[PDB]
Paper text:
The psychrophilic AKp contains a more polar Thr26 instead of the Ile residue. In the structure-based sequence alignment, we found that other AKs also contain hydrophobic residues in the positions equivalent to Thr26 and the five neighboring residues in AKp. These observations strongly suggest that Thr26 in AKp disrupts hydrophobic packing in the CORE domain and likely decreases its thermal stability compared to other AKs including AKm. Consistent with this, the Thr-to-Ile substitution at residue 26 significantly increased the thermal stability of psychrophilic AKp, as indicated by a Tm value of 8.1 °C higher than the WT protein. The AKp T26I mutant showed increased catalytic activities at high temperatures (55 and 65 °C) compared to WT enzyme, and the temperature of maximum activity shifted from 45 °C to 55 °C by the mutation. Interestingly, the Thr-to-Ile mutation did not significantly affect the catalytic activity of AKp at relatively low temperatures (5 °C to 45 °C). In the structure of the T26I mutant of AKp, the side chain of Ile26 adopts a conformation almost identical to that of Ile26 in WT AKm and interacts closely with the neighboring hydrophobic CORE residues, as in the WT mesophilic homologue. The AKp I26T mutant has increased the apolar buried surface area compared to WT, and almost half of the increase resulted from the six-residue cluster including Ile26 and the five neighboring residues. The T26I mutant of AKp shows an average B-factor (50.0 Å2) similar to that of WT AKp (51.4 Å2) for all protein atoms (residues 1–213), whereas the average value for atoms of Ile26 (53.0 Å2) in the mutant is considerably smaller than that of Thr26 (60.7 Å2) in the WT structure, even though the side chain of Ile is longer than that of Thr. These observations suggest that the flexibility of residue 26 is decreased by Thr-to-Ile substitution in AKp, and the relative rigidity of the mutated Ile26 likely results from enhanced hydrophobic interactions with neighboring residues in the CORE domain. Our structural and mutational analyses indicated that the significant thermal stabilization observed in the T26I mutant of AKp resulted from optimization of the hydrophobic CORE packing.
Adenylate kinase (AK) is a phosphotransferase enzyme catalyzing interconversion between ATP/AMP and two ADPs and is inhibited by P1,P5-di(adenosine 5′)-pentaphosphate (Ap5A), which mimics two adenylate substrates. Structural studies have revealed three characteristic AK domains, namely, the CORE, AMPbind, and LID domains. In the present study, a structural comparison of AKp and AKm revealed suboptimal hydrophobic packing in the CORE domain of the psychrophilic homologue, where a polar side chain makes contact with hydrophobic neighboring residues. We also determined the crystal structures of two AK mutants, which showed the largest thermal stability transition compared to wild-type (WT) AKs.
Author numbering: 1 to 213
Write the structure that this text describes.
Amino acid sequence: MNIVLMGLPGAGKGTQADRIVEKYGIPHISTGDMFRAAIQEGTELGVKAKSFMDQGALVPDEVTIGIVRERLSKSDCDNGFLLDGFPRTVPQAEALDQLLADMGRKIEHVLNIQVEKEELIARLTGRRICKVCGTSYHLLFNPPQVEGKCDKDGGELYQRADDNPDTVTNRLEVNMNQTAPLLAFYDSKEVLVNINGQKDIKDVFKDLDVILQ
Ligand SMILES: Nc1ncnc2c1ncn2[C@@H]1O[C@H](COP(=O)(O)OP(=O)(O)OP(=O)(O)OP(=O)(O)OP(=O)(O)OC[C@H]2O[C@@H](n3cnc4c(N)ncnc43)[C@H](O)[C@@H]2O)[C@@H](O)[C@H]1O
Ligand SMILES: [Zn+2]
């Protein structure tokens, strides 16, 4: 089960990932989580990634492909994996084909979660993230059971610094700059499915899960 969960910032990739991972027990590999981990280690990689992330810019492709090479070569991905927000560029996409072709494998499904820009913006305005596990809530649209506390581990919730309005606008634009030619890459190789992400979390999930089996 070699999957890519694709979508613009705030499309519900993280939200849908928890469901796919919990159901099929394949590792969730998000580049954005990895960069935040490196920032928490305070590695040099993290310090350098963070300049870009704070602007809402992409982290350079070579850096990014790097950590993905390393990560997907770990034995826990041998039987499958859920890439989340990678690739975002044609060179990332290619380097992914190549590193998998070296292992006698390929990506088998790119699930592209589509949401209009205005909705994406509303989603990243009230978003909250768990200190303990990294899961996201939304104060309006998908709140925790108990205010301020994650439903999974009781973790405190907080606001990601890049979820401010200026950085969000930058993030949507930058990522969209990459999107159509990448859809065209995957659409042409016959693995891309578009998914209406603009409805209930459970309903988006059914659409995904249809494809997964
Ligand atoms: N491959 C790469 N190349 C280069 N640089 C890279 C890279 N990967 C990362 N980077 C760098 O790292 C940075 C951060 O990356 P990262 O943090 O991965 O991602 P992002 O692009 O910032 O967007 P997310 O993946 O955080 O959003 P998502 O769709 O998972 O949203 P969620 O499910 O929370 O949902 C959003 C909100 O909506 C709510 N919600 C979810 N589903 C629904 C629904 N159906 N209806 C209503 N509300 C919903 C949630 O509760 C939540 O509040 C980038 O800006 C870049 O600098
Ligand atoms: Zn949590």
